[PDB]
Design a protein around this nucleic acid. Structure first.
Ligand SMILES: Cc1cn([C@H]2C[C@H](O)[C@@H](COP(=O)(O)OP(=O)(O)OP(=O)(O)O)O2)c(=O)[nH]c1=O
Ligand SMILES: [Mg+2]
Lengths: 702, 106
DNA sequence: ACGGAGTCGCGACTCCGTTATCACGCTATGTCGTCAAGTTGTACC
DNA sequence: GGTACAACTTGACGACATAGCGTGA
């Protein structure tokens, strides 16, 4: 077993030089210092460690270090350097797996961290947490440039190898070693009876918990998805941007000819009091009072000193001791809720629902609810809502900071990172290109936004053909998970009933709801315990109707209350009552999942969510890992030059860009067989079903 | 009355070519230093009656004139020598300060 | 733990309740640090 | 009379922290 770390000149898109690599070994207990010319010896040491059956440990090695070494080995020596999967261990994945809750424990320690590392899984953050940090290379280089005198550039420190970078790499290696020993000090996720630093790779992957293997296979597959990427349609996005900009100018002209301008009291600094006594009054907006001013200036001449010649007049137009109201000529901005609320007060409408800071609720429900006497403004409310929607679409598409047109690289492929663990419940999150924010198939222009996303925009590298995209989704995931949990209460009757037709369609017929996704939203809100006002807001009716539907479904399915009572008596000790808070004692801060993780719980009425979301996330994660493993072992090839590629793993649904429709059908059948394998492996008491679609883009695949 | 309340059209037709010293107040409903300075202006309208023109203008009910003259702060009293702007001061003055400001311009 | 409300024999006595949930993004707006430049009291030859 | 000077003040500008609200599963 060795622990290594590298140092490149740039990120994955611009890496072209290997600076230094430091190796520590347990069999020698010595530091192995290298040079920029020792790149071949570094690769030979790694290949010897793989051939000896050892384990090489990096920090975030799956996303950066392994493909960086592969690209450097290719572009320098033209030698195929491809390390195996099981001989690589990440410390970031183990840290995210063991310490899955940093926000509820980082406070009380901030006395250590500088402040910017609050809830950070970086390598320097653990260097401050383990009290082993001797400076920073970036701060040292900034001090160096300020010592010489020339200006600072953020990229110059990754251009030249030096002893400071060498010692920084040594510090990174020893922080990685201390962090690895701290994570191997665990007892639940790792049995301490076997010294894991002196075992084989098969012994290490077999004598630990299943969750570590699941997490590392998921990290390897997500790194493969990152180096794959997702296509894009630049001309269609630019045509949509021009169309939305023209319609935005059209609606801005309509709203500026509908409404008018006014004055805003923004600008006051000092304090106003009662002119009779001196008591402050909160019934006035903020004003300002100057401190220097008058009428006549200082006497400079002799007759000015004698009062004969009048002095110079007050040019600055302010007098010391005259309070005024500093205002500005605000123009009506329809992207300002405050301006919309001001105009609705001036139209004669009385707001009802308020927030915690006095300003009333301004959303689509109350904009449908406003009924005034003016038909022109009553029609212009719809133009306000359409302007807000188009402003949201443009801010998502191009004018935002995290813009698609700003993040698409030169290959036309979107490269957006994905955090594997992410949230505390185990469900994965998405980085700065957020693929979850892409609208659905019924929002206005979201059909065109999904039609601009497809696998047909990448031609073949040899034949030059548009590919075929395959999308596979699961239906009733959490509901069949709930059936699996409460089968031991209701003798499997709900699990037998859920396989008879679509459960969401049957609930839609039973509740008389307009759309299937509205039925999904309602049954999820009833599952996770919504209030009566929230149920009435979803169903579009009153809280009496909400209580009627809640009592009807609760008397239809009585096992849910028994399951909630079982959990409440399971992990919760007691519960006190504050007028504004709720003191609840647990003495059990976590719930064991399907694999055996310590999934942290936040709330006693969210422990059910903590159970079910973790169950669905683990099912989907091991499902896609098994699907990838089966598609490898059946004889296909993963990648752009091969046959298929993974490009979308947002939530409970994959998109696979195959080569032909027969290959896509093989992928769908393989995903179905992998889903049945998971349902047989984890002792699933019901049947799991998938649904695969075959279209050129997301307009057909979903 | 004592202080003539004007509109935008009355301002444009009876201020710019009125041939006299015209003092126009700019006031809003929700403030408030104008409520302080308004009895002072009512006293000056009787003290200096027969030598200048004292008027008031609402910046809320007349949205034309105040964006044309570009007012950043209210109250603000503008002295009009033959209609055009000659001298002005921003704030809520007192009676003696306002009398000194009028004596410093005549 | 006091508001909402079921109830004792319509006012008050007394019993129940109390969250939809994890992610990210964003334009608006108030706070506060930083700075360019006069200025106005001011101390002394 | 004169002359430097030094904190005060006014105005502008930029980084930063919420605020509901909007997307998805
Ligand atoms: C849509 C939605 C999902 N979820 C959670 C629970 C769901 O089981 C999970 C994914 O939801 P879905 O995948 O939309 O539910 P589904 O699998 O039954 O239907 P479909 O085949 O059309 O995809 O995310 C919510 O908590 N609130 C929501 O509004
Ligand atoms: Mg689904």
């Amino acid at each position: 077993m060795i622990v290594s770390d590298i140092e490149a000149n740039a990120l994955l898109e611009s890496v072209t030089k290997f600076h230094c690599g430091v190796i520590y070994d347990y069999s020698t207990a010595e530091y192995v210092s290298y040079r920029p010319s020792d790149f071949g010896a570094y690769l030979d040491a790694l290949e010897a460690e793989v051939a000896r059956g050892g384990l090489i440990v990096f920090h975030n090695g799956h996303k950066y270090d392994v493909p960086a070494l592969t690209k450097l080995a290719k572009l320098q020596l033209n030698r195929e350097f491809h390390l195996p999967r099981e001989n690589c261990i990440d410390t970031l994945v183990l840290s995210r797996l063991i310490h899955s809750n940093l926000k509820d424990t980082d406070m009380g320690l901030l006395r250590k961290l500088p402040g910017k590392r609050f809830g950070s899984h970086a390598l320097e953050a653990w260097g401050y947490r383990l009290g082993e940090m001797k400076g920073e290379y970036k701060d040292d280089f900034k001090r160096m440039l300020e010592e010489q005198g020339e200006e600072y550039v953020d990229g110059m420190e990754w251009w030249n190898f030096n002893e400071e970078m060498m010692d920084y790499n040594v510090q990174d290696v020893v922080v990685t070693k201390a962090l690895l020993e701290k994570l191997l000090s665990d007892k639940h996720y790792f049995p301490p009876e076997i010294d894991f630093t002196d075992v084989g790779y098969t012994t290490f992957w077999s004598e630990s918990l299943e969750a570590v293997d699941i997490e590392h296979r998921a990290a390897w597959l997500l790194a493969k998805q990152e180096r794959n990427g997702f296509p894009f349609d630049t001309k269609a996005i630019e045509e949509l941007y021009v169309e939305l900009a023209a319609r935005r100018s059209e609606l801005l002209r309509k709203l500026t000819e509908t409404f008018g301008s006014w004055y805003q009291p923004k600008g006051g600094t000092e304090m106003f009091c009662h002119p009779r006594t001196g008591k402050p009054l909160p019934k006035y907006p903020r004003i300002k009072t100057p401190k220097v001013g008058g009428i006549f200036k200082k006497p400079k001449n002799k007759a000015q000193r004698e009062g004969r010649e009048p002095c110079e007049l007050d040019t600055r137009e302010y007098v010391a001791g005259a309070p005024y109201t500093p205002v500005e000529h605000v123009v009506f901005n329809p992207s300002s809720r405050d301006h919309i609320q001001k105009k609705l007060q001036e139209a004669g409408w009385v707001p009802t629902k308020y927030t915690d800071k006095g300003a009333p609720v301004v959303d689509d429900e109350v904009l449908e609810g406003v009924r005034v006497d003016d038909p022109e403004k009553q029609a212009a409310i719809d133009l306000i809502k359409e302007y807000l929607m188009i402003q949201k679409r443009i801010g998502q598409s191009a004018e935002g900071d995290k813009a698609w047109l700003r993040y698409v690289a030169e290959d036309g492929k979107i490269h957006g990172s994905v955090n594997p663990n992410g949230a505390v419940t185990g469900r994965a999150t998405h980085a700065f290109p957020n693929l979850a924010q892409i609208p659905g198939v019924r929002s206005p222009y979201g059909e065109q936004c999904r039609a601009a996303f497809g696998a047909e925009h990448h031609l073949d590298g040899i034949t030059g053909k548009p590919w075929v995209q395959a999308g596979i989704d699961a239906s009733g995931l959490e509901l069949r998970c709930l059936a699996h949990f409460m089968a031991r209460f209701d003798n499997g009757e709900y699990a037998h009933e859920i396989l008879n037709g679509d459960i969401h369609t049957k609930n839609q017929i039973a509740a008389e709801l307009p759309t299937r996704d509205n039925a999904k939203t309602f049954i999820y809100g009833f599952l996770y315990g919504a209030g009566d006002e929230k149920i009435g807001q979803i169903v579009g009716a009153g809280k009496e109707r909400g209580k009627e539907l809640k009592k009807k479904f609760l008397e239809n399915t009585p096992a849910i209350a028994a399951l909630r009572e079982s959990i409440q008596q399971t992990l919760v000790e007691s519960s006190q009552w504050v007028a504004g808070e709720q003191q609840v004692k647990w003495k059990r801060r976590w719930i064991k999942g399907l694999d055996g993780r310590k999934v942290h719980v936040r709330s006693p009425h969210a422990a059910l969510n903590t159970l079910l979301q973790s169950a669905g996330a683990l099912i989907c994660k091991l499902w896609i890992i098994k699907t990838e493993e089966m598609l490898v072992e059946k004889g296909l090839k993963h990648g752009w030059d091969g046959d298929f590629a993974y490009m979308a793993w947002v939530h409970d649904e994959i998109q696979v860009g195959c080569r032909t429709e027969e290959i896509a059908q093989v992928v769908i059948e393989t995903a179905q067989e992998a889903m049945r394998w998971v349902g047989d492996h984890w002792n699933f008491r019901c049947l799991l079903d998938t649904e695969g679609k075959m279209g050129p883009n997301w307009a057909i695949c979903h | 009355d004592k202080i003539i309340h004007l509109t935008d059209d009355s301002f444009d037709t009876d201020v710019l070519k009125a041939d006299g010293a015209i003092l126009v107040d700019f006031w809003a409903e929700w403030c408030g230093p104008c409520k302080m300075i308004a009895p002072i202006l009512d006293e000056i309208a009787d003290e200096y009656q027969g030598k200048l023109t004292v008027a008031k203008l609402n910046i809320d009910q007349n949205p034309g004139t105040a964006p044309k003259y570009g007012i950043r702060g209210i109250p603000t009293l503008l002295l009009f020598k033959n209609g055009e702007v000659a001298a002005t001061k921003v704030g809520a003055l007192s009676k003696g300060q306002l009398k000194e400001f009028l004596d410093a311009n005549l």
